[PDB]
A paper describes a structure:
The [name]-1 Env is a trimer of gp120-gp41 heterodimers that are heavily shielded from the host immune systems by N-linked glycosylation and further protected from neutralization by conformational masking and considerable sequence variability. A glycosylated region near the base of the third variable loop (V3) of [name]-1 Env forms a supersite of vulnerability that is targeted by antibodies originating from diverse germline genes in multiple [name]-1 infected individuals. Here, we determine structures of antibodies in complex with [name]-1 Envelope for all observed members and ancestral states of the broadly neutralizing [name]-1 V3-glycan targeting [name] antibody clonal B cell lineage. Here we used cryo-EM to visualize the interactions of a complete inferred [name] clonal tree with the co-evolving virus Env.
Based on these two early intermediate resistance features, we selected Envs from days 358 and 526, having both G300 and long hypervariable V1 loops of 18 and 28 amino acids, respectively, and Envs from days 836 and 949, having both N300 and short hypervariable V1 loops of 11 amino acids, to identify structural hurdles to [name] antibody interaction. Despite poor sequence similarity, examination of the V1 loop regions of each unliganded Env structure demonstrated a structurally conserved hydrophobic core and variable hydrogen bonding and/or salt bridge formation that ensures coupling of the V1 loop to the V3 GDIR/K motif. The d358 Env V1 displayed considerable disorder in a portion of the loop with flanking hydrophobic and salt bridge interactions ensuring the loop remained closed over the V3 GDIR/K motif. Visual inspection of the V3 GDIR/K motif in the G300-containing d358 and d526 Env maps suggested greater disorder in the broken sheet structure compared to that of the N300-containing d836 and d949 Env maps. The d836 loop displayed a kink in the loop near the V3 GDIR/K motif leading to somewhat greater exposure of the motif. Together, these results indicate a shared role of the V1 for protecting the neutralization sensitive V3 GDIR/K motif that is mediated by a conserved hydrophobic core.
Residue numbers in the entry:
A (entry chain G): 1 to 52, 52A, 53 to 82, 82A, 82B, 82C, 83 to 100, 100A, ...
B (entry chain F): 485 to 510, 533 to 619
C (entry chain E): 3 to 106, 116 to 418, 431 to 460
D (entry chain H): 1 to 30, 33 to 91, 96 to 107
E (entry chain J): 484 to 512, 532 to 621
F (entry chain B): 484 to 511, 531 to 561, 567 to 620
G (entry chain A): 160 to 212
H (entry chain I): 116 to 159
The structure:
């Protein structure tokens, strides 16, 4: 069964490096494009990350230039999200996701366990 | 040139049917030509076979003993003769397709009684 | 009341899909002199002169939904794989290497390596004195001293040598319809990527597209005949690829100095490795020359073309997004050896002073890098090795198209890069029977 | 720039009612809809403006051609409480929630 | 499969089911193991081509029946019309004449040539 | 092999035995070596199909194309009694594409009906 | 000493059941082709032949 | 009764580097393995 498994969250100090890993369980990871989004209480949720894992194509949203990075390891079938210079506003649940079909690269089908990010201000 | 007939109505195309039939006939990586050759030959053989089954081989057009019905088409002589480009009429009759297939077998057999 | 008939030879169409087969010229054993991509099995000679314009032929085209490009890609990858099937396997090389930098900006890039190897007698060992590129060697665990290295591949997969006479630049190769099928070519110059075409022509066989290989740019292609053309699945669907097809070419030349020399290295009975033996010259690393500020002019035209389709979000340009090295850098295989170039200088600058301005000053330079080991087709695990070539290697090419995303140069797919060429054409079959009054 | 304004902000309805949520776009595209229960992963509900997604009953429906799209949820099951998000490929809005009256 | 229904019946019933048998005779519906289908396709096509060719050599294509111009000998089968037509079933008659197979194969190339002395 | 006997004879005797040539013209794991028998059979079948196709497009056969004497002025008796087939075949072979063509038009003139 | 081959190339063994004397093997024309045999015993390597079978 | 059927085996094996060696700790069923000549100790 296709499934997205998320690692544990992080409860670290602001102004720190933050890292998350998500594995596409039970699927050919190389072929389909994953994505990252944010969900928080009462927040206009936001699109974070792109990853076409075959060639490792990447692009970033407007607020995330430079700060946000991710990469992939095809052998591990795991996408590694990593944020630089953590801040209080980054507090949100993060989902590694997928679209209904691997034809268009958008995220409205699959969702992980929602590993949370908490900023110990 | 037969594609030139595609870009014209029925009357002009009627004088150029033969050339289409003429052209219709003819590293393990390179072995794939055999499939294309076999399938093209099979399509041609299906054509000749089915021409046989109408009792209408040799002749390109044949007086074959089934009638028409207004349900399959009501549009008249003049429209189909002059104005009508081939693909549109082919699509219109294709709405029926299999029902406008069928019966000529027993008509071949009627003349074969 | 008018009674039934059968036409034969009806000129009508059905949008069928089938396996195309190509036609290509040939002159010798390796498809003209040497071969990678050509295949004489696709027969000579060019049957393209069979061409005809047709009246009133309104037909739809869709390059995004084209399928024969996929079959052609399958053909290329299968041919390339079976070409490398007989060549040598470099498994024995993966032994510990005691290494250092060069003997004496500069080719300190080179890592000098000495290692043990077996002779033709299976039980006798000898030392060696070899040179390798830095990115093609991984140091062992840093808990041990970093002077020891290994080949990158053997932690993951095997290796294979590239045969010497199997080396070839892309040939124009024509894709030809089999009997009963036909190829429809759209001729309207303003083709919008998909939709009806009115000046449609038909050919027994199509243009001799070259299987060119390059990342982030289209080179040695066929220019457009209108002004610079834009094609996309849907522009407002921002995160998809946009392709740009140039109407005027731009020249790029790539070179590395030095009378570099290779040496064969006997590794077991009946095969030899080709290591780089020495570098002889100033050997300023792999700089490439761009045709002066003609790029400065061309970006103006591209910006105007993009601005035509969209409201006034001011157009500008940016470095590659990142990701893997092959996506980070423009890549190509002109000299047999593979080249990679940081394209930051291409996309820097935003303002009209260098985007509504034109002049001829001096060739723009790109920092570049050389590699041997490569997973050829965009990371798929055909881990293979290319040998070095003697010095004074040089290349020349004409740039013809670009790849972009939407709200940066894109990485792209080589299948997509060829699909950018095959938009002209479509496949169809004949249905020779019908009825009338 | 919110180019998907879900309205009304929230609804307080007893079970079995028919909930309606409007979403207004201004750019051509596909309006799908999300839903997540409190503390649970989201699920696709409506796709392409009117079509139900997989495993979604006939309770949910949508429309229409034009810039305004009206989600509808007949026979409000309490399990369908929680937040929703109007969405299409490159667009989603602020989100709206349904709760007990 | 209806053509086999005539195999289970006498002569007259099979007299109309000739075409349905003819229709299906032509065609029907790592792993390099599967290309033996091409052998089968080639062999079936060759059998059909042999049938059409041989019909050609009688000068009797298009028709399934043709007024061929040769003697007949009771030595091959002396039995009367009614038994061979009414009571008979096809496999038995085919077995009976099969004894004379090459004794009922041969000439009519020359018969075609005979009426082709003026054609 | 009898048809080659007609090859060694003039027009008259060979006219009696043209059919035998047509009869013979049609047919007669680790070792993938011998697979090219398949494509050989395919090519032979294609040659036969080409023969039948050309026969069809013409509609022995009372056809209607004339014959310019420039291609051959030699009289009736020569090409019945004296003439061995290879010689006359070579003689007309000089005009091959000059004498390939209008049988399709001979079909077309009767396709006017 | 050493084996001669390994300075230049590899080696292979001959299988035991793969052993065979020259068999008379015929060569047959495919359909549409024919084989022409000259019978003149004084054949001079090339030229016309009269008793062709 | 119990997995005395199973035999614990330890052995030398090569790493990805062709010349280096490491020991292992593996399990195999009895019928899938055979002891060497009994003149040597049967533990091998």
């Amino acid at each position: 069964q296709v499934q997205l498994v998320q690692s544990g969250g992080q409860m670290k100090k602001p102004g720190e490096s933050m890292r998350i890993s998500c594995r596409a369980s039970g699927y050919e990871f190389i072929d389909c494009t994953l994505n990252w989004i944010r969900l928080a209480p009462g927040k206009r949720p936001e699109w974070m990350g792109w990853l076409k894992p075959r060639g490792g194509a990447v692009n970033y949203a407007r607020p995330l230039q430079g700060r946000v990075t991710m990469t992939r390891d095809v052998y591990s079938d795991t996408a590694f999200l990593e944020l630089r210079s953590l801040t209080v506003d980054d507090t949100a649940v993060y989902f590694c996701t997928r679209g209904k079909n691997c034809d268009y690269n958008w995220d409205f089908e699959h969702w992980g366990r929602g590993t949370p990010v908490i900023v110990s201000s | 040139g037969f594609l030139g007939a595609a870009g014209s109505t029925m009357g002009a195309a009627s004088m150029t049917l033969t050339v289409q039939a003429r052209n219709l006939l003819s590293t393990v990586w390179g072995i794939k030509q055999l499939q294309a050759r076999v399938l093209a030959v099979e399509r041609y053989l299906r054509d000749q076979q089915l021409l046989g089954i109408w009792g209408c081989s040799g002749k390109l057009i044949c007086c074959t003993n089934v009638p028409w019905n207004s349900s399959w088409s009501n549009r008249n002589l003049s429209e189909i003769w002059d104005n009508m480009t081939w693909l549109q009429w082919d699509k219109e009759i294709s709405n029926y397709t299999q029902i406008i297939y069928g019966l000529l077998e027993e008509s071949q057999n009627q003349q074969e009684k | 009341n008018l009674w039934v008939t059968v036409y034969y030879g009806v000129p009508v169409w059905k949008e069928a899909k089938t396996t195309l087969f190509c036609a290509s010229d040939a002159k010798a054993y390796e498809k003209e002199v040497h071969n990678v991509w050509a295949t004489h099995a696709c027969v000579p000679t060019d049957p393209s002169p069979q061409e005809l314009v047709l009246k009133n032929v309104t037909e739809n085209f869709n390059m995004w939904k084209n399928d024969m490009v996929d079959q052609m890609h399958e053909d290329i990858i299968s041919l390339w794989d079976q070409s490398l099937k007989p060549c040598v396997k470099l498994t024995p090389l993966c032994v510990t290497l005691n290494c250092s930098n060069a003997r004496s900006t500069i080719m300190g890039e080179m890592k000098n390596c000495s290692f043990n190897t077996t002779t033709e007698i299976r039980d006798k060992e000898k030392k060696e004195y070899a040179l390798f590129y830095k990115p093609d060697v991984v140091p062992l665990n840093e808990t041990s001293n970093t002077s020891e290295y290994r080949l990158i591949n053997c932690n993951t997969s095997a290796c294979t040598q590239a045969c010497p006479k199997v080396t070839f630049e892309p040939i124009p190769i024509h894709y030809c319809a089999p009997a009963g099928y036909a190829i429809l070519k759209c001729n309207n110059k303003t083709f919008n990527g998909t939709g009806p075409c009115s000046n449609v022509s038909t050919v027994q066989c199509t243009h001799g597209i070259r299987p060119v290989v390059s990342t982030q740019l289209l080179l040695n292609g066929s220019l457009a005949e209108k002004e610079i053309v834009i094609r996309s699945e849907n522009l407002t669907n921002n995160a998809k690829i946009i392709i740009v097809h140039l109407n005027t070419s731009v020249e790029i030349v790539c070179t590395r100095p030095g009378n570099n020399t290779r040496k064969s290295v006997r590794i077991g009975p009946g095969q030899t490795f080709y290591a780089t033996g020495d570098i002889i010259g100033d050997i300023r690393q792999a700089h490439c020359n761009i045709s002066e500020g003609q790029w400065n002019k061309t970006l103006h035209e591209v910006s105007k073309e993009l601005q035509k389709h969209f409201p006034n979000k001011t157009i500008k340009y940016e470095r590659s997004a990142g990701g893997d090295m092959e996506i980070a850098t423009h890549s190509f295989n002109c000299g047999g050896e593979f080249f990679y170039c940081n394209t930051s200088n291409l996309f820097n600058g935003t303002y009209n002073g260098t985007y509504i301005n034109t002049s001829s000053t001096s060739y723009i330079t790109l920092q570049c890098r050389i590699k041997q080991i490569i997973n050829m087709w965009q990371g798929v695990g055909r881990c293979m090795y290319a040998p070095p070539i003697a010095g004074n290697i040089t290349c020349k090419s004409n740039i013809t198209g670009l790849l972009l995303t939407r709200d940066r140069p894109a990485g792209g797919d080589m299948r997509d890069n060829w699909r950018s060429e095959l938009y002209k054409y479509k496949v169809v079959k004949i249905e020779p029977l019908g009825v009338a009054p | 720039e919110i180019v998907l304004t879900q309205s009304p902000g929230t609804l307080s309805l007893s079970p079995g009612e028919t909930a309606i949520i409007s979403c207004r776009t201004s750019q051509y595209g596909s309006l799908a809809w999300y839903q997540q229960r409190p503390g649970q992963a989201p699920r696709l509900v409506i796709y392409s403006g009117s079509t139900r997604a997989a495993g979604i009953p006939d309770r949910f429906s949508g429309s229409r051609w034009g810039p305004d799209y009206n989600l509808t949820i007949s026979n409000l099951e309490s399990g369908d409480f929680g937040v929703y998000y109007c969405q299409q490929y490159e667009f989603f809005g602020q989100g709206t929630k349904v709760q007990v009256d």
